[PDB]
């Protein structure tokens, strides 16, 4: 993978992150795209920000952890956007899928658990 992409999740961690991203996008709580993730990080309403390590170039998502250092949000980098290749109906693999807090989310606590799991990988 890319050495600049940090942190790197495991297989089950990426599977749980993809399931949480699909549950957020199906319940209208996730935004795909780099500009939408940057706007969700600047607005302060994004609960989590996920990146993709298989990006050419990978520097375009390099501001995604740094904005996570500007809003106190967990950051994670899927080995490949292909994990979200279909994402929320996206034909092309998805990379920046800012998962924003959803009022009374049916998986709000589950998303919080993913956050708690994404804060321990960066050590």
């Amino acid at each position: 993978v890319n050495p600049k992409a940090y942190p790197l999740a495991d297989a089950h961690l990426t599977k749980k992150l993809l399931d949480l991203v699909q549950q957020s996008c199906n319940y209208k709580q996730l935004r795909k795209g780099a500009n939408e993730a940057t706007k969700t990080l600047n607005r302060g309403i994004s609960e989590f920000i996920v990146m993709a390590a298989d990006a050419e170039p990978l520097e375009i998502i390099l501001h995604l952890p740094l904005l996570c250092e500007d809003k106190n949000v967990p950051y994670v980098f899927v080995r490949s956007k292909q994990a979200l290749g279909r994402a929320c109906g996206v034909s092309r693999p998805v990379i920046a899928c800012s998962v924003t807090i959803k009022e009374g989310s049916q998986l709000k606590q589950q998303i919080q658990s993913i956050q708690q799991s994404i804060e321990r990988l960066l050590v």
Binding site: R43, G44, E69, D70, K71, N72
Partner: protein, 397 residues
């Protein structure tokens, strides 16, 4: 039936006029004697709508005994309108009917300290401390001893109040403010640390400790004290706002933005944190920050004052005046919002807007403000009026 008549009199006072409402209030007062709440409501209706208010205060003092609030309102109406020694004689006559020195002795000490002959005020404070000692009476005696000069007797009274009322952080804060006005500053920091460790939750004592540790150099200890105050409450909005102000006062703008984001994530329903996030944001980014502050914290006086400051900074005087009017209608007791409204009236507008702002500041006394508490807690502007304090808060912006 008396409560329904009082509600009808209040609705008549607020709906149309004041003659029939005062007649209904006089009929309810002469029909049957009520408690101090109806007398206070009649005194407020007489003060809001000179001679009639003094007559209502005399009727409440003659017909409703054991009413310290009505007697204090009558003494304040006599000192404001009639005379200061007549109000002192009225307070001395009300002290002969109510032997409790809780609020009558403090009001007499304040009336003797606002006028001349401070030895009589010191004797009244000593008599109140010898009759019924308390933390508020000791703090008032320490303030009356420290407003004249920083003598050793004021420091001894502050030490006695800190030894007798160590659970109360007001005596420790007064001792720290008395020691901070001297040449040394380590004694004030030690007194503030003792007040923060003896309360253990003291927000203004920890704020004064952070201000003393930041203003005297070595601001890393000030940041450590601010972190300990934020973790000792835990997650106080005032301590987070003080830490954000200390981070924004230095060159760490990204750390200040991260502290503001953490304060918004840990306490989104805070008007001071929303105002700090609106003031710390960029000029094209303030329109989204003010909208997010209005959506998260609606009908807030600090958010409305920040919106008024953003409208005045964007060369929109007609929007800043409307936002200041909305902030005065939402909360007229705010100090920072009234100071911003007076500054906007003095900067953009004629003398009529400044006169209306002065009348709004004189009708409702501003308190618990950002710029008002910085001038109301000092010893140099302790016995001053409300209009001069409002002018000093508007001129220092």
């Amino acid at each position: 039936r008396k409560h329904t008549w009082m509600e009808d009199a209040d609705s008549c006072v607020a709906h149309n006029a004041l003659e029939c409402a005062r007649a209904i209030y006089a009929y309810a007062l002469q029909v049957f004697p009520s408690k101090k709440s109806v007398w206070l409501r009649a005194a407020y209706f007489e003060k809001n709508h000179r001679e009639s208010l003094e007559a209502l205060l005399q009727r409440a003092v003659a017909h409703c005994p054991k009413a310290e609030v009505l007697w204090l309102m009558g003494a304040k109406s006599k000192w404001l309108a009639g005379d200061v020694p007549a109000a002192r004689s009225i307070l001395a006559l009300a002290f002969q009917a109510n032997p409790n020195s809780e609020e009558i002795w403090l009001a007499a000490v304040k009336l003797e300290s606002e006028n001349d002959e401070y030895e009589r005020a010191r004797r009244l404070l000593a008599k109140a401390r010898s009759s019924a000692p308390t933390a508020r009476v000791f703090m008032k005696s320490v303030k009356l001893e420290w407003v004249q000069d920083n003598i050793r007797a004021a420091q001894d009274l502050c030490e006695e109040a800190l030894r007798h009322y160590e659970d109360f952080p007001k005596l420790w804060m007064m001792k720290g403010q008395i020691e901070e006005q001297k040449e040394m500053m380590e004694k004030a920091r030690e007194a503030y640390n003792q007040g923060l460790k003896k309360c253990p939750h003291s927000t203004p004592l920890w704020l004064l400790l952070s201000r003393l540790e930041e203003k005297i150099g070595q601001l890393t200890r000030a940041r450590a004290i601010l972190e300990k105050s934020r973790l000792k409450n835990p997650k106080n909005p005032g301590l987070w706002l003080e830490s954000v102000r200390l981070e924004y006062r230095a060159g760490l703008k990204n750390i200040a933005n991260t502290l503001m984001a953490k304060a918004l994530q840990e306490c989104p329903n805070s008007g001071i944190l929303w105002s700090e996030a609106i003031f710390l944001e960029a000029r094209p980014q303030r329109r989204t920050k003010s909208v997010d502050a209005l959506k998260k914290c609606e009908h807030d006086p600090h958010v409305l004052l920040a919106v008024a400051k953003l409208f005045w900074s964007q060369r929109k005087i007609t929007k800043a005046r409307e936002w200041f009017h909305r902030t005065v209608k939402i909360d007229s007791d705010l100090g920072d919002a009234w100071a911003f409204f007076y500054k906007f009236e003095l900067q953009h507008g004629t003398e009529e807007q400044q006169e209306e702002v002065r009348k709004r500041c004189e009708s409702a006394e501003p308190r618990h403000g950002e710029l008002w508490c910085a001038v109301s807690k000092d010893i140099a502007n302790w016995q001053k009026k409300i209009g001069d304090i409002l002018r000093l808060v508007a001129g220092r912006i």
